Structure formats: structure tokens, C-alpha cells
Amino acid sequence: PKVGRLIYTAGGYFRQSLSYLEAYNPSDGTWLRLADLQVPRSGLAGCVVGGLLYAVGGRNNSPDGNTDSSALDCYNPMTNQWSPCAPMSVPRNRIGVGVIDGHIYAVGGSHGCIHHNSVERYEPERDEWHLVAPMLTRRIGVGVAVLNRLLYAVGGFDGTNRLNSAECYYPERNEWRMITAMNTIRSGAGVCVLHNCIYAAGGYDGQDQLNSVERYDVETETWTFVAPMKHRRSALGITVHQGRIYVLGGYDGHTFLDSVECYDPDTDTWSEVTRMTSGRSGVGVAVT
Amino acid sequence: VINPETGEQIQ
Ligand code: NA
Numbered sequence: 477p478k479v480g481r482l483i484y485t486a487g488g489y490f491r492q493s494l495s496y497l498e499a500y501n502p503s504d505g506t507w508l509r510l511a512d513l514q515v516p517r518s519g520l521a522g523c524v525v526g527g528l529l530y531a532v533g534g535r536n537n538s539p540d541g542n543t544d545s546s547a548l549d550c551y552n553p554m555t556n557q558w559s560p561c562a563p564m565s566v567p568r569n570r571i572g573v574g575v576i577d578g579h580i581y582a583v584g585g586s587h588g589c590i591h592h593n594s595v596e597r598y599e600p601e602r603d604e605w606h607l608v609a610p611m612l613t614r615r616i617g618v619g620v621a622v623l624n625r626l627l628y629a630v631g632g633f634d635g636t637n638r639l640n641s642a643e644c645y646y647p648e649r650n651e652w653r654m655i656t657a658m659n660t661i662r663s664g665a666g667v668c669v670l671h672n673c674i675y676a677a678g679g680y681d682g683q684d685q686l687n688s689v690e691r692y693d694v695e696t697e698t699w700t701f702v703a704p705m706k707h708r709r710s711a712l713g714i715t716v717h718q719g720r721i722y723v724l725g726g727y728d729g730h731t732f733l734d735s736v737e738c739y740d741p742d743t744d745t746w747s748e749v750t751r752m753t754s755g756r757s758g759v760g761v762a763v764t
Numbered sequence: 765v766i767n768p769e770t771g772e773q774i775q
Contacts, residue, residue, distance in 0.1 A: 518770070537772050617770075664769045680769040729771075757772070
């Protein structure tokens with residue numbers, strides 16, 4: 477007939493940083509091989525704006541060596557072609573990304589030693605990055621959600637410590653306020669909004685990868701736990717599709733997962749729904 | 765030589 481919306485998953489890591497762009501049809505159970513990244517990379521972040529998929533930051537961890545990426549690259553699903561864009565002010569391994577109003581927010585990540593608390597806004601219409609109010613905490617492996625046109629930044633790693641702290645950027649006032657910390661410390665968790673709530677799923681607490689999932693209600697300002705995920709996973713991809721959450725791969729201290737679970741809010745149940753062609757951590761994921 | 769969190773080997 478025709479084909480609807482897809483969960484794109486881009487780059488990642490298994491033995492080395494990867495180039496795989498693949499897509500999943502949640503309504504047919506099927507997986508698409510699509511154009512490889514110009515450069516392989518891991519701990520990048522994915523987002524869509526106006527039909528187009530964007531691949532932000534990360535690092536090429538090669539057999540040869542490794543480089544932290546300041547690169548922004550754009551995938552057009554119409555042409556199956558990547559094009560490069562204005563690079564960021566700085567390279568951002570383990571970046572967090574949110575989209576408010578056709579604009580991309582790159583928050584935190586590392587340039588080797590330097591753990592960032594800087595933040596930059598990219599305007600596709602101009603093809604231009606601009607620095608904005610930095611966060612209060614330095615954070616890499618930071619979950620990033622956009623709720624009621626605010627950017628929430630959740631957990632991460634400040635260079636010394638793993639955080640359960642979370643803050644909130646106000647685009648209109650250009651300022652950051654701390655919010656209720658989560659029950660659990662979570663570096664490299666997966667974070668998104670669904671039916672008006674931030675969810676934090678998986679992550680490394682500093683000892684052990686997690687399968688616990690807590691959600692923020694912005695009104696009651698509390699972090700209630702919900703159903704854990706089947707598999708413990710850190711450095712996982714996450715997205716929302718058809719009002720359900722999908723978690724894609726990641727690491728569990730032993731092996732690189734290929735599992736993808738799916739959370740029905742309506743019935744507070746998870747369920748495994750496919751595998752990825754390979755097991756990989758630190759993929760970037762988005763829907764269009 | 766391993767990153768406990770990402771599972772990436774470094775050095
Ligand atoms: Na991928």
C-alpha cells in the first residue's frame with residue numbers, strides 16, 4: 477500500500493564505532509538497511525526536524541585510534557543520502573539532544589578530558605549553531621526530554637560522580653533550574669516524554685547496569701517507579717512511537733544487547749518485540 | 765581499558 481513512520485537507529489558500538497543506519501517498522505516487524513554514515517560513531521544522539529533525521533556529536537572509537545565528533549550530519553529519507561552541516565562549537569561524545577520548535581539543543585557530552593556543561597542551539601533554516609545558558613552541572617551520558625516546550629536534562633556523569641540530579645532549561649528566559657532528583661543514580665540512561673511525563677529507563681548507577689524505570693510528573697514534582705524492563709541495559713537508544721516507548725540495545729556489563737523492549741503505559745507492561753541485526757551500545761534513535 | 769557504562773574499550 478504505502479509505508480508509515482519508522483524508528484531509525486544510527487551508528488553505535490560493537491568491537492568498534494559503527495556506520496549502520498537501520499530502521500524498524502513497528503507495524504510489520506521488519507528492519508531496513510539504509511545508507512551508512514560518512515564516518516562511523518558511537519554515543520551520538522538522534523533527532524528529527526521537518527522530515528529530516530540528524531546525527532549529532534558522539535566519537536569514532538576505531539581500531540586505529542579515536543576522535544570525539546563536533547559533527548552534525550543530516551539524513552534525508554527521500555534520497556537515502558547523508559549531507560554534512562555546520563559542526564558544533566566543540567566535540568560532544570555522549571551528548572544529549574532535544575528539539576524545541578524546529579531547533580536542536582545539544583547539551584553536555586565530553587571532548588576527551590573536558591566534561592561539558594555548555595549547551596548549543598542549531599537553526600536548520602540558517603545552518604548555524606549558537607551557545608546558550610550553560611547547565612548548572614557538567615553532564616555526559618545525559619538523558620534529555622522536551623516537555624511543555626521546556627528541555628529537561630536528567631542524570632549523567634560530571635567527570636567525578638554519576639548524578640541522580642536533573643535540571644530544566646527555559647528557552648524563553650534562557651535559564652536553568654534544578655528539579656527533584658530521581659530515586660536512582662543513572663549515567664547513560666534512556667530518557668523521553670510520553671503522555672506528559674519524563675521517563676528514565678536503565679543506565680549505570682556506578683556499580684551495576686539497571687532495568688528499573690521511573691517517571692517524573694511535572695505537576696506533583698515526584699519520581700514514581702513503574703514496571704522494570706526485562707533486561708538490564710546502560711547506553712541504550714530510546715524513542716516514543718505510537719504512544720509506546722521502545723528501548724534499543726545497550727550494554728549490561730557482560731554483552732552488547734540486540735534486544736528491543738516496548739512499554740504500554742495503558743497496561744504498565746513491557747514486552748520484547750524484536751532484535752537488531754547486531755548488538756550495539758550508544759546508538760542514536762529517532763522516528764519519522 | 766574498558767568503560768563499564770558504554771562497554772567501549774579505550775587504550
Ligand atoms: Na544503529
